[PDB]
Design an enzyme around this catalytic site. Structure first.
Site, PDB file in Angstrom:
ATOM      1  N   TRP A 188       0.848  -1.184   0.000  1.00 44.56           N
ATOM      2  CA  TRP A 188       0.000   0.000   0.000  1.00 44.56           C
ATOM      3  C   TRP A 188       0.884   1.234   0.000  1.00 44.56           C
ATOM      4  O   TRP A 188       2.063   1.168   0.358  1.00 44.56           O
ATOM      5  CB  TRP A 188      -0.959   0.026   1.200  1.00 44.56           C
ATOM      6  CG  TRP A 188      -0.302  -0.224   2.488  1.00 44.56           C
ATOM      7  CD1 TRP A 188       0.311   0.700   3.291  1.00 44.56           C
ATOM      8  CD2 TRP A 188      -0.166  -1.485   3.146  1.00 44.56           C
ATOM      9  NE1 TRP A 188       0.815   0.089   4.412  1.00 44.56           N
ATOM     10  CE2 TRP A 188       0.539  -1.253   4.347  1.00 44.56           C
ATOM     11  CE3 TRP A 188      -0.564  -2.786   2.837  1.00 44.56           C
ATOM     12  CZ2 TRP A 188       0.848  -2.276   5.241  1.00 44.56           C
ATOM     13  CZ3 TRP A 188      -0.261  -3.802   3.725  1.00 44.56           C
ATOM     14  CH2 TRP A 188       0.443  -3.542   4.912  1.00 44.56           C
ATOM     15  N   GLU A 208       4.686   9.332  -1.512  1.00 40.10           N
ATOM     16  CA  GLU A 208       5.057   8.873  -2.848  1.00 40.10           C
ATOM     17  C   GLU A 208       4.121   9.439  -3.913  1.00 40.10           C
ATOM     18  O   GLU A 208       4.553   9.732  -5.034  1.00 40.10           O
ATOM     19  CB  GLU A 208       5.052   7.352  -2.916  1.00 40.10           C
ATOM     20  CG  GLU A 208       5.827   6.600  -1.841  1.00 40.10           C
ATOM     21  CD  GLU A 208       5.603   5.064  -1.966  1.00 40.10           C
ATOM     22  OE1 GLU A 208       6.049   4.463  -2.975  1.00 40.10           O
ATOM     23  OE2 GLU A 208       4.966   4.466  -1.067  1.00 40.10           O
TER      24      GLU A 208
END
Ligand code: HEM
Ligand code: HEM
Ligand SMILES: CCN(CC)CCc1cc(F)c(F)c(OCc2cc(C)cc(N)n2)c1
Ligand SMILES: CCN(CC)CCc1cc(F)c(F)c(OCc2cc(C)cc(N)n2)c1
Ligand SMILES: C[C@H](O)[C@H](O)[C@H]1CNc2nc(N)[nH]c(=O)c2N1
Ligand SMILES: C[C@H](O)[C@H](O)[C@H]1CNc2nc(N)[nH]c(=O)c2N1
Ligand SMILES: [Zn+2]
Lengths: 414, 414
Positions: free
Chosen positions: B284, B289
């Site tokens: 996940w 990011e």
């Protein structure tokens, strides 16, 4: 002949300078210590044998840098210091050699992001100093000069070099200008938790503390190995900037302020094998060192708590990023406050662009530029600054600045 | 027997695991490459000679991990793979050995911050696959399983191991789920600049592109060294999260969204000397990011421009920190949007605390934990997270994940 790439513009530079490198890093082929704070190769006693190649290595790059390499003036300087190392088992640097050595210690400091200014450094020769009062006088003129009414200028003052090792000149302050830290009855900390030991050392030597938050500390100056003595910088020389925000009128109520001059004093300057145990150097602040590290570190001033409180933020759930939110406002406020007083400060975006620009000329007009990524990338907004995406080779060139133990864990007191 | 300190809590841990280390780092005693993106020791061809000690080294830690080290079941397994390496010049892993090797590749990934979950990984054995369609089928079941209706689960699918080297299984996608990038007439980029080459490779093989921004790409699957073929993941399996802000009703108008499943597919898994050239793995997302790197990198989606525009910020002067301001809002929005859909996401504060917690047990129940600071510290708000203040030793243990060249610069096309 290694290569380092920038994965934001696809710029590639070729590092050959790393071949001139001498000292070691702490890394091996099977381990990398790039993230260790104070490695044993960064910390500082030498004899007469090794002292001459160090002189030879240094003198050769100094004459190579004035297009007079190997000539007559070089070869006699070579023999003159060679002779003088026979005689004394040490030697003395020329005034021009001290200016060069000092400027290139800065140049070679891989953790410094400001190095674009390395050529413009003002070197003060204090090698005639003999007493703690004399040191206090050289340091006051340093602070007045470098401060220049908020128009900050880079400078360094160089007290006499180590010799026997027990008659060492040492500033016991980590920075010339620092706020005192005091512990409370409940254990909590007033002022600056960093210095709480140093503050007690000053009160151990008779400092009458005005036990508050932003109390400028006294200088503890050790001269020729003698016990250090207290000296209070004239307040008119300590320039301070009260922090206000260009949106929040409650930002004054916080009541924060910070000194203008960052001026590190506990380091060791290494030139041609000679060790200068006291050599305070100053420049100007990048905003993040105050707004991010000084203000919001957990064991520093630790104000994220209250800045989010007055901002009224989601202080129940971690994933609201209330910390990130309060941290960007504090840094906009630092920058604005310093700027509105004409006090020199640089933002982490401008300083990291300038460093990449600096890195460019260093790979051309020098063949490289030692850089420590762990330390260059600013402590906020890492990846929007261009240094996050720039590969860097770290290596140890000399002349250099080194860490040294603290004098109160070594000084044969009496 | 090295020591690593945390300069925020004064916690000290003792690393002995670094002694079991085998591969090299890129650093020497006179240089540190801790900041090089893809070092030559991280990238990937082997023979029969060295293949047995690699098997021996692996099998010995696998039986050491089930309190059956050196026993009968071990010694026969030792001779059985020894025998089979005589026979075939290679060998086959047991199902239990594959699960262990895979889980510890993750464990050993020094740049992974999520590794607290390394024990909870779901290993799918695809070593019976023979065709690109078969690969497509294993990958769809991976995506459905790992996605679990937004309740994300960690998993990895392992296609057959390299042998001759020219009959290699390779997913040509860097991630299973990625948005296409298209260049414009004026040179500008629509979609995702990263993939603009891969998008053209897919259109080279006949992808009819719906030339927009967030177009999920097709899989390019190469089976047993054959030319790869296009496959379109059923849209009902690609879960996407539309990004909205919990304050700004204009945040919808931006029109951004991101896929739920991060699932890296271009890496090489190394177990006991055996090389698995295709091994997509998913977990996940940590918020940064997407919100920091995907959205605000200069050569990615690059939305700081417009987020500050709608926020109406000081977009003339760099020192206003308008970039920092627009960046914190984008990350609060990412987190909120994913959370309001029950889609698993972790914030950079919680994941870095968990990693320090993970690092704690790794130094106790294992004797160490390889960590790459350059990569662990999140790309925003570095120093308010606890990993910024934690020293880390980076070293290369095996089993491990490695980078490999891209197949279109190697595959003997026909
Ligand atoms: C002129 C403006 C300057 C700026 C903006 C600047 C900025 C910085 C910053 C942000 C650091 C990181 C250390 C930390 O975060 O505490 C640093 C480190 C350092 N700077 Fe610079 N600095 C400047 C001038 C100077 C000067 C005048 C010297 C010495 C002549 C110097 C030498 C160093 C050294 C030795 C370090 C630490 C290296 C280590 O830790 O081993 N800098 N500087
Ligand atoms: C479960 C949740 C996970 C989270 C939150 C997570 C997070 C991250 C992050 C932020 C990075 C940094 C790389 C980048 O910024 O692009 C990374 C790297 C990495 N992760 Fe993890 N990851 C997770 C699961 C996994 C799994 C399931 C695997 C494999 C079994 C894995 C193996 C790796 C590898 C191999 C790298 C890159 C190392 C390198 O670049 O050499 N991670 N991860
Ligand atoms: C290991 C403990 N840390 C924190 C106490 C050391 C921090 C530190 C060590 C050094 F040697 C430095 F030169 C240093 O320079 C900060 C600095 C210096 C100058 C002239 C300007 C500026 N803008 N900033 C900062
Ligand atoms: C060198 C080029 N970069 C950017 C394209 C490589 C980035 C990268 C390489 C890897 F090997 C990775 F495993 C990786 O994992 C990101 C990731 C993976 C998972 C399972 C979860 C998560 N939350 N995040 C990311
Ligand atoms: C653990 C790590 O070595 C330590 O926190 C370093 C990281 N990088 C840094 N970078 C700068 N500029 N200043 C610092 O104090 C630190 N601290
Ligand atoms: C130059 C440097 O190696 C490169 O930008 C790295 C720095 N650290 C990183 N850390 C993470 N997690 N992801 C990255 O892409 C990068 N990029
Ligand atoms: Zn290193």
């Amino acid at each position: 002949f290694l290569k380092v790439k920038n994965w934001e513009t696809d710029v590639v530079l070729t590092d050959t300078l790393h071949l001139k490198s001498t000292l070691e890093t702490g890394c091996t082929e099977h381990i990398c210590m790039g993230s260790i704070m104070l490695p044993s190769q960064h910390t500082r006693v030498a004899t007469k044998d090794q002292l001459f190649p160090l002189a030879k290595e240094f003198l050769d790059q100094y004459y190579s840098s004035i297009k007079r390499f190997g000539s007559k003036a070089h070869m006699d300087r070579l023999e003159e210091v060679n002779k003088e190392i026979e005689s004394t088992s040490t030697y003395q640097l020329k005034d021009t050699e001290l200016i060069y050595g000092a400027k290139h210690a800065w140049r070679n400091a891989s953790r410094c992001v400001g190095r674009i200014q390395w050529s413009k450094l003002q070197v003060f020769d204090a090698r005639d100093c003999t007493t703690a009062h004399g040191m206090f006088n050289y340091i006051c003129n340093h602070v007045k000069y470098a401060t220049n009414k908020g128009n900050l200028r880079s400078a360094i003052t160089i007290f006499p070099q180590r010799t026997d090792g027990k008659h060492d000149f040492r500033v016991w302050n980590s920075q010339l200008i620092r706020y005192a830290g005091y512990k409370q009855p409940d254990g909590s900390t007033l002022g600056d938790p960093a210095n709480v030991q140093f503050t007690e050392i000053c009160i151990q030597q008779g400092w009458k503390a005005p036990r508050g938050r932003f109390d400028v500390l006294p200088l503890l100056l050790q001269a020729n190995g003698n016990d250090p003595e207290l000296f209070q910088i004239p307040p008119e020389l300590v320039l301070e900037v009260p922090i206000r925000h260009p949106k929040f009128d409650w930002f004054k109520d916080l009541g924060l302020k910070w000194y203008g001059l960052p001026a590190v004093s506990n380091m060791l300057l290494e030139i041609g094998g000679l060790e200068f145990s006291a050599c305070p150097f100053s420049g100007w602040y990048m905003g993040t060192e105050i707004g991010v590290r000084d203000y919001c570190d957990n064991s520093r001033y630790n104000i994220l708590e209250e800045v989010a409180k007055k901002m009224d933020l989601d202080m129940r759930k971690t994933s609201s990023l209330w910390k990130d939110q309060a941290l960007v406002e504090i840094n906009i406020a630092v920058l604005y406050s310093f700027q509105s007083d004409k006090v020199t400060i640089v933002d982490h975006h401008s300083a990291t662009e300038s460093f990449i620009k600096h890195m460019e000329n260093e790979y051309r007009c020098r063949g490289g530029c030692p850089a420590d990524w762990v330390w260059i990338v600013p402590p906020m907004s890492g990846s929007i600054t261009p240094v996050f995406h720039q590969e860097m080779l770290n290596y140890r060139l000399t002349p250099s600045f080194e860490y040294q133990p603290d004098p109160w864990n070594t000084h044969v007191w009496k």
